[model samples]
Structures are given as structure tokens and as C-alpha cells.
Target: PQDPRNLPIRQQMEALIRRKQAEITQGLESIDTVKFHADTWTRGNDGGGGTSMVIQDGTTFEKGGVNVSVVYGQLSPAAVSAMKADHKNLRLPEDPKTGLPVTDGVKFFACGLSMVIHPVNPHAPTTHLNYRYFETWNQDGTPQTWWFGGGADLTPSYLYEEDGQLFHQLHKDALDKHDTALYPRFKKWCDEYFYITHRKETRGIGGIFFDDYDERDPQEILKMVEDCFDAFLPSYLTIVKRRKDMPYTKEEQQWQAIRRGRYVEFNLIYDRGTQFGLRTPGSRVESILMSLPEHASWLYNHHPAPGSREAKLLEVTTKPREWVK
Candidate 1:
């Protein structure tokens, strides 16, 4: 039997996320002129922290991050009760004897691997993937409620039918190997979650996104997460190779800037992770905002001409398509 005390599941997940980070960074370094800047940090007064590896102004990738966080700390009563809405499995009860809740002392732990890629070339798409494990502990050090969550999605400045199809197909194949029905559900979920409510369009051609995700054995879920993580390179690198060196004009670069503006809008206004980290005490600001690109623009309701490549990207973003089928 595995010893839970010596090597907790959280620690095992930390090792996995960090290892995957190295593999991904090495792969990116193979193509880019610049190497990532490695930054390790600890929580101000919390129990754990994490590492951030970022590449900026690279030949291929404009800016990107391969980050891993394993942070654990206590949550106030209000925080514990607020989580009940999204995390249905939470146990928020009044004190056993006093009948008054003890929301003041809640133990929590969170760990995950998160990455974002913004390529230098307009033709190459921007990609993001995150897979995380979260849990809360009872006073006795036993796990109270636990779940695994995270997903990968794509954002393209220019439309390429084959690239979109292949990206979706590879992800579908990965999930299909585990459960034949997951792709459609997750694909639809991605479209909905990444939607810019005010803008009334999706962030990009969807990949997959899921959260508060625990309905099976934890070990089995972890294995599935690993499979999804491994699928990232084949799904994205192939597209990059096909388009990274393709020629482009300044006009195209301007269009790319406009699309990046939308990316910025979603992360700043609608992204849950950004909101959560900002409100939490002792959270680092730099890591929370790492998903953003280095350059972006907000033109006053810009629109591309009809029959243009930029207009084509708009068509797909406005309406989510089933690429795998």
C-alpha cells in the first residue's frame, strides 16, 4: 500500500506539473532564440508557493509561460461558504456543539500546471492549457472535499481550417480514448465558458475547458489529466511548424493586435483565475497576469473588410463549430 503520510497525493501532483513544465519549456526552447526566465517564489505567509518560467520577445514565441503552483493555506468562514455555490461537494457546517459555524478556520490546498503561448507570427495561433488539483482538509487532517479541474483552449488571429480541425481532432481523440462521450460535452463547455459576454463572441476557436471536476476515482482522474497534458504538444506544435515562418504584412500584424485585444478583454474581465488570485491574501500579482500577451490594442469597434482573412477569423469566432466531426 502507498504511504499517504510520506508522499501525499498533492506532492505527487506537484512533481508531475513541474516535470511537464520542464518538458514543455525544453520543447519551446528548441524553436525560439530566447530562453525562459526561471522565477521561483514562496507565499508571503502561507505554507507553499511555486515556480514561473517565462519567455519574452522570442524569435518564434512573443511571450509565453510554463508555470506550476502548489499553494496551501487557511480560508476564512466567508470564503468557505462562498465556495459552496460552485463546489457542490463542500462541507460547510455549523460547529458540532455550539451550533454556530466555524467558518474562521478552513484548511485548503491548491496545485496546478498552467501555460499560455502567444506566438510572434500572425498565422500561428495562441494556445493555453491548465490542469489543476484542489482539496480542503478537515480539522483532523483528513480530506474533506476534493476535486480535479483544468482544460486547454486555442485562440487564433487568423483562420486556418485544417489547423482548427487537427487541433480539435487530436483533443477529441485523447478524450475518446478514456471516455467516448467526453469530447462533445467538454467542447461545448469550452465554447460557453470562454465566451465574452459583453463582446458576444467566444475568445477563439474552442479547444476544451472544465472546472469543479470530480465525479470519479481521484487516481483515474489524474491519469486522464496526464493524458490531456501529453496531448498538448502534438496538437499545437504541428500547427506552429506549418505557419510560424509564413510571410505577413504590417496590415496583418495590425489585425493580430486587434485580436489580441479581445484576448486581453477576456482574461481581465471574465477569467475566474485572475479574479480569485487578486482577492486572495498574499497572492502574487505577476503570476496571476502571466496569461496576457506582451502587445495588444483596443481600436474603437474595429471591423475587417468582407472576404478578407481577418474577416474569416471573425466568422468562426462569432459562431462555434464542431471541428472534430
Candidate 2:
């Protein structure tokens, strides 16, 4: 249950999350002039927990949350098998009786920063970002396998072409700095993964998402993360500034609620991250639902009229495209 290296590993990731969380929370609070409440929690006997920064009823944002979590513990064979179903790399022999992994257990270390912002203005778009590092450890405390995963994406109730372009372009440039070919492929992956099969729509304009990284130099990979965090952030703030105070009719606000309904359906039914977090032991339910908006609506058999802005957004939702040429 204890290791000399555990302290350093936990500390290193703690520092990283602390830094990223402060940056994001400060940026949001600055624009909205709304203070965020910091809530620190522990897993008690469960190993570790996290800090959650949440804001609500702000001038610019209705609800926004930034959280960082670090948790490590043993996974039963059934748990390992369920995880391997998605991770694939968690390969261990199967349990003959349960058809799961055959082992006493597997040790896992996971740390991540996850955030979501939902704006008060219907004209403004919602956004989500997450970055995580995970590893499977051997009994002797040496690392057996490790990987990195992170992604940032935009979700707008009303589609603005330039906004979409900027959203995609910024993320693309960040990844392109690491590898010229990565942006296109990752962007496609985002478009594919965020699709709602039942609703027949994409979540948003699309941004780059990658997982199981760590094939390259460690230092370079860290730099890639830095570039993603530092670069293109200002543009996101600017987009919010541009749209936050714009006028909107009640109809538009209702449309936003409808879009939020779709968002709820996706997170509840399709989001793998949500599922994983909920399934993990000692995972906070409040933090898991932070991505959900403060308000949403499910209308019965509703349809937007032809040639309206709502219709335009629906059109874009129906088809994913190259936002940045």
C-alpha cells in the first residue's frame, strides 16, 4: 500500500494538476468576475482523491468547474477485464471461472485534470477539456506500462463559422507543433467519437483528441502538453468575450436548453470518460457530473425551421467538416 516512489509520483502529478487548474480557474474568474469555490477531498482508506473548483451563477458563465484527481489502488480481475475491454493494453491472463483476468490484482495509478464551462449567454458556446496520465504497476513497484491521454473540444449551441474555425485551428496548431500529421487524424477521431448515433448529430465543431500517447521522448511529450496548455488559450477566452454579451431572444435561450438536452444524453449514454470515472472506486459523483449544464430541456418532436440560425447549427451538426483549411 506504500512505496517511496509513490510520494514523488503523486507529488509530480499533483503539481501539474495544481498549475493547470489554477490557470484555467483564474482565466474563467477573470472574465466573469466570479470567484470559484475550492473544495479539497480525500479518498480516506481508498488511497487518494482530488480538488474541485466550481463556479456558478456568474455574469458570464452559468456553471463552470475545474477538477484534478489522483487515485491509485488495486483492480480486481473483473475490473481489470472491464478496463481491458477498452484499454486493450491491460492484457493479463483471463480468470477461468469468471472469464476475467486471472490475478490477485493489478496496481493502477491515474491522475487527471478535467474541466467544463457553460456560459450564461445563449450566444456563447460550452467547452470541455481533459488531460490524464495513467500507468499499470508491477508488484515490485516498477512500471509495467504507462500512457497519456488528453483532449479539448468546443460545444456551441449556436454555430458560428469563425468561432468553429478558430476552435479547430488553435487545437490543430498545438498538435501540429508536435507532429504535422497528428492534427488531421486526431480531429477526425474527435468528430467520430463525439457523434451521437441515436440523435444523428456531432457534439460540436470538433477538436483534436488523442490517447495512449508516450511513444516519443518524454521531454518532448511534456513540451507538447505545455504547448497545448499555453498556446491557443487566449483565443478561447477571446471567443467567449466576443459572444458573452451579445443579445439573444428567448427563443435562442430555449434552443440552447434543447442543445443542452442533447449534451446530457451524450454524457449519460455515450461518454466513455463518464462511465470510467463513475465505475472507478472512490470517484466523486459531483465531479463526474460537472460537465452537465445547469439547465437543459428535452422537447417533443421539435424541429427548427428552414434558413434560421438554429437550422444552420443543425445543418453543421448533421455533417462534420474541416473547420480549418
Error of 2 at 9 (Å): 6.8
Task: Give lDDT tens digits, candidate 1, residues 1-325.
Answer: 5753356667767777988999989888887789999999887676678899999999999999998988888767667777777788776566557664664676889999889999999999999999999988877776678888788988999899888998888888888888878889899999998899988898899898878888777776777888888888887888998889999989889988988999999999998888888887777788889999999988996889999888888788888887977
Candidates in order have lDDT scores of 0.86, 0.82
In candidate 2, what residue range of length 10 has the lowest lDDT sum? 3-12
Name the regions of candidate 1 deviating beyond 4 angstroms.
Answer: 1-7, 94-100
Give candidate 2's root-mean-square deviation (CA, Å).
3.6
Instruction: Please state the error at residue 60 of candidate 1 in Å.
Output: 0.3
Worst 10 residues of 1 by lDDT: 1-10
The most accurate candidate by lDDT is 1
What candidate 2 gets wrong by more than 4 Å, as runs, is 1-11, 95-102
Model 1 residue pairs with clashes: 77-103
Query: In candidate 2, what are the lDDT values of residues 143-172, reduced to their tens digit?
Result: 566667778888898888888888888777
Per-model TM-score, in order, reads 0.94, 0.92
lDDT of 1 at 110: 90
